[PDB]
Write an enzyme that holds these catalytic residues in place. Structure first.
Site, PDB file in Angstrom:
ATOM      1  N   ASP A 196      -0.927   0.541   5.140  1.00  0.00           N
ATOM      2  CA  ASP A 196      -1.315   1.720   5.063  1.00  0.00           C
ATOM      3  C   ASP A 196      -0.535   2.501   6.287  1.00  0.00           C
ATOM      4  OD1 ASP A 196      -2.718   4.122   4.391  1.00  0.00           O
ATOM      5  OD2 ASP A 196      -4.444   3.426   5.816  1.00  0.00           O
TER       6      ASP A 196
ATOM      7  N   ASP B 113       0.861  -1.252  -0.078  1.00  0.00           N
ATOM      8  CA  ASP B 113       0.036   0.040  -0.049  1.00  0.00           C
ATOM      9  C   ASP B 113       1.010   1.229   0.091  1.00  0.00           C
ATOM     10  OD1 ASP B 113      -3.074   0.994   1.914  1.00  0.00           O
ATOM     11  OD2 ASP B 113      -2.212   1.523  -0.148  1.00  0.00           O
ATOM     12  N   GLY B 114       0.547   2.210  -0.864  1.00  0.00           N
ATOM     13  CA  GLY B 114       1.104   3.594  -0.605  1.00  0.00           C
ATOM     14  C   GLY B 114       0.142   4.608  -0.881  1.00  0.00           C
TER      15      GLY B 114
ATOM     16  N   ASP C 180      -4.917  -3.260  -2.616  1.00  0.00           N
ATOM     17  CA  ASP C 180      -6.276  -2.777  -2.667  1.00  0.00           C
ATOM     18  C   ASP C 180      -6.474  -1.595  -3.742  1.00  0.00           C
ATOM     19  OD1 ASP C 180      -5.188  -0.754  -1.019  1.00  0.00           O
ATOM     20  OD2 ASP C 180      -7.319   0.031  -0.842  1.00  0.00           O
TER      21      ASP C 180
ATOM     22  N   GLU D 299       1.869   3.538  -4.631  1.00  0.00           N
ATOM     23  CA  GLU D 299       1.219   2.027  -4.869  1.00  0.00           C
ATOM     24  C   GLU D 299       2.086   1.218  -5.629  1.00  0.00           C
ATOM     25  OE1 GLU D 299      -2.910   2.837  -6.438  1.00  0.00           O
ATOM     26  OE2 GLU D 299      -2.711   4.892  -5.053  1.00  0.00           O
TER      27      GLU D 299
ATOM     28  N   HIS E 189     -10.232  -2.456   4.447  1.00  0.00           N
ATOM     29  CA  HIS E 189      -9.306  -2.778   5.597  1.00  0.00           C
ATOM     30  C   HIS E 189      -9.947  -4.074   6.284  1.00  0.00           C
ATOM     31  CE1 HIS E 189      -6.914   1.226   6.084  1.00  0.00           C
ATOM     32  NE2 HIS E 189      -6.329   0.474   5.246  1.00  0.00           N
TER      33      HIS E 189
END
Length: 155
Positions: free
Chosen positions: A134, A10-11, A70, A48, A124
């Site tokens: 995250d 995640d980014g 995601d 991301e 989440h």
């Protein structure tokens, strides 16, 4: 039996574009390794991608990877656009350059070295590793130490 490794990424940015960060969790045989980094100025999409890049590049041998994220940008990229882009040698239909080609090429490169198994997630809920990522990304974006030299900013 090929080493089996799970990767979570995640980014994001504190406002887009803006200070950004990424977080990745690389798990193997119950043992997990963390990855994170913050940049002065970058975008959500680049982060991301970076997350997946760094994690995959960390692997030092051929493995069976189960990548989970995601990110829709990465999803659509891999699922659709990526194939067409390579055909046109990295250039959209209107002749315009594909965005973030630097990171995309790097991701593609790293991808081809393992047997990937993507897993797209929604929220989440029921996805603790991702929530944790995250968290890693935000903390890293709070006090960025690196700089995204591949980010153009643009007038």
């Amino acid at each position: 039996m090929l080493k089996r490794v799970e990767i979570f990424t995640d980014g994001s940015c504190l406002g887009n574009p803006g200070p950004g960060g990424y977080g990745a969790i690389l798990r193997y045989r119950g043992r997990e390794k963390t990855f994170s980094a913050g940049y002065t100025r970058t975008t959500n999409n680049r982060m991301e991608l970076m997350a997946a890049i760094v994690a995959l590049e960390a692997l030092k041998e051929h493995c069976e990877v189960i990548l989970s994220t995601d990110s829709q940008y990465v999803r659509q990229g891999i699922t659709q656009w990526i194939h067409n882009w390579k055909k046109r040698g990295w250039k959209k239909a209107d002749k315009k350059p594909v965005k973030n080609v630097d990171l995309w090429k790097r991701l593609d490169a790293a991808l081809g070295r393992h047997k990937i198994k993507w897993e797209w997630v929604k929220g989440h809920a029921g996805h603790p590793e991702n929530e944790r990522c995250d968290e890693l990304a935000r903390a890293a974006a709070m006090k960025p130490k690196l700089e995204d030299t591949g980010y153009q900013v643009e007038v």
